Amino acid sequence: MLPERLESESGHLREASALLPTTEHDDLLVEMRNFIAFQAHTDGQASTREILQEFESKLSASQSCVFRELLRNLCTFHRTSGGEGIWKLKPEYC
């Protein structure tokens, strides 16, 4: 997983109206949320490098498959004036 992969890639899942909700990745989703909320440099947000630095070593094969989708679940993506990619927690998860 490279920074360009997380920030560029389009979504591959259908609208949430046609999807059935699954609990398979709740554990990972919560850990991702709590890190971005409390454990990054700024509360409620984390840069791409921060998230990668935290999780890239800890993900299994199946977790790697859905990691970007879980990130898009939790956060909106932003680019600063300096060009840094920042993921900010949606208000529903704050």
Add this chain to the structure above:
Amino acid sequence: MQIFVKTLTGKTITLEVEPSDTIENVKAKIQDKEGIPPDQQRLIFAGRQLEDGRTLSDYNIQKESTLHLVLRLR
């Protein structure tokens, strides 16, 4: 019915609930066991954050389902 709730530390607790219970009711039950006020709780289940007004049945939460408690940031 009985459901499971993963607390802030990751340990699992047991709640006695009904399908007609609102998420607000569930958070109140969590307060009694964990001491966390409802206005500081958010519940996550099946990749979704649970809204207070809706019921457990609304999210198709069944017997022995596992909810996830997280601490409100703001």
